[PDB]
Design a protein around this ligand. Sequence first.
Ligand SMILES: CC(=O)N[C@@H]1[C@@H](O)[C@H](O)[C@@H](CO)O[C@@H]1O
Ligand SMILES: CC(=O)N[C@@H]1[C@@H](O)[C@H](O)[C@@H](CO)O[C@@H]1O
Ligand SMILES: *[C@H]1O[C@H](CO)[C@@H](O)[C@H](O)[C@@H]1O
Ligand SMILES: [Cu+2]
Ligand SMILES: [Cu+2]
Ligand SMILES: [Cu+2]
Ligand SMILES: [Cu+2]
Length: 499
Amino acid sequence: AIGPSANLVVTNAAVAADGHSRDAVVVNGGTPGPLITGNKGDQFQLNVINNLTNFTMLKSTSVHWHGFFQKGTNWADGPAFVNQCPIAAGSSFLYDFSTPIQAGTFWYHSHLSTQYCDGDRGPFVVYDPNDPSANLYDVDNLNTVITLTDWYHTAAQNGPAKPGGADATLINGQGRGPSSPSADLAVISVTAGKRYRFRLVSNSCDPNYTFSIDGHQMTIIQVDSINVQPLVVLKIQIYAAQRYSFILNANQAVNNYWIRANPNQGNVGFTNGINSAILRYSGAAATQPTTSQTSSVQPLDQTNLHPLTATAVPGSPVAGGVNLAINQAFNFNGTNHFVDGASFVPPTVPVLSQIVSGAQSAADLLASGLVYSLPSDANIEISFPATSAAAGGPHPFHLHGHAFAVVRSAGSTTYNYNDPIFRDTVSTGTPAANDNVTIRFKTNNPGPWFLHCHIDFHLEAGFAVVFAQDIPDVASANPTPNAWSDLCPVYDAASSSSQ
Ligand SMILES: CC(=O)N[C@@H]1[C@@H](O)[C@H](O)[C@@H](CO)O[C@@H]1O
Ligand SMILES: CC(=O)N[C@@H]1[C@@H](O)[C@H](O)[C@@H](CO)O[C@@H]1O
Ligand SMILES: *[C@H]1O[C@H](CO)[C@@H](O)[C@H](O)[C@@H]1O
Ligand SMILES: [Cu+2]
Ligand SMILES: [Cu+2]
Ligand SMILES: [Cu+2]
Ligand SMILES: [Cu+2]
């Protein structure tokens, strides 16, 4: 609800998310942060105020607006040392950008190191006054957004480098156990007979969830901010950073129903209402559900998602039928992730500043072996063949600045150049299934753009490349405000323990 223009004050505070108390990074007093809203066409002016004091979770910050294209505003994209230097403690920085052509469910999170795990993360929804699916539901507001969070009792920079499971799943900021199975659960209210556009966002740093609601079907109308043909499911497997709008018809008996969100790892199952929340019909008692889980007969399959209005796949309906095709060979050496033999090490000068100060190709750009230049107005094919060489499957890869066509999904051997879904975060599957997840996009948006695994622990360990798209037009297409130009000198001046 906090309108198109708002202050985002970022501070440290103790939080009892799951009944356990620990210090964390919070936005306007709480984590996950407040929900940001606006309408398609709005100008978003988000003043991020860095009042952090704690070095262990990082005093500096940078916020990424997940799903937004940032066309002409690459500087505002967020990723530290790619699009900006971090905001320094005590200073504030304005993120100013328009959204003329996008509408849907989004989110925002720190894009400095693993900071967002320590709770710089929250939802962001842009409503469409002319939404094509508006006639399919009665209710769509703050109370229809559902966030999922993997919550850790030990801080990001304090625990294991690859945690492999959270202590508690949070649904709408609340969750349980297993050393605190009496903590408050989230309650979501429905009125029997009404239809709801529930906007599901994974704010997750790592795990994926099998999401379901006892006794109810779900009609998917949106995937990663892309309007989608109505698809009836009863189980959604949602990977880190992904979004779905589904319509729930409140057509069951007035009762309490278990909302379930089962992690792929960590504390699995539902003993004592862990990984759980409550769907409560108006009139039903303020108690826990007694509903029992049924087998998922219609699970979400990504190859069944198709865009609402026909949307052509870049290039031509043949393998390699594009201007530039790139394969991403994954690797891991015990502590570091490698793409095509290179592990991402953030440079001192943000890639953006390097281009504006007049780098011409990948060879002029630091983080060498990690930047790929892309020509403008071209079709691009990326493939991410799954391999045992990189531990921690399935890896959800995310592309900044673009939505892409998923011509080949995980768990499928078919290539769809006709009508596959477009999105911005995609599971790259498992080596065991011989997956070769393949995506396509159009270079219509000049600037440096991150492509990385949206398991934040893996990004931190270098699992990243940068697409330097249309270098010639970067500086001129992305004019930067002095506040942005000031960011680096101020941050670079800082002592190490004030970072
Ligand atoms: C009593 C003790 O061991 N203290 C530490 C605390 O310093 C640290 O902040 C936390 C990690 O988030 O773990 C532990 O509680
Ligand atoms: C930045 C740097 O020097 N890191 C390397 C890293 O690439 C490599 O994975 C490791 C061996 O496992 O040795 C070093 O620490
Ligand atoms: C599948 O992805 C690409 C296809 O372009 C191949 O080159 C690779 O070998 C993988 O198996
Ligand atoms: Cu993101
Ligand atoms: Cu993003
Ligand atoms: Cu990963
Ligand atoms: Cu990113």
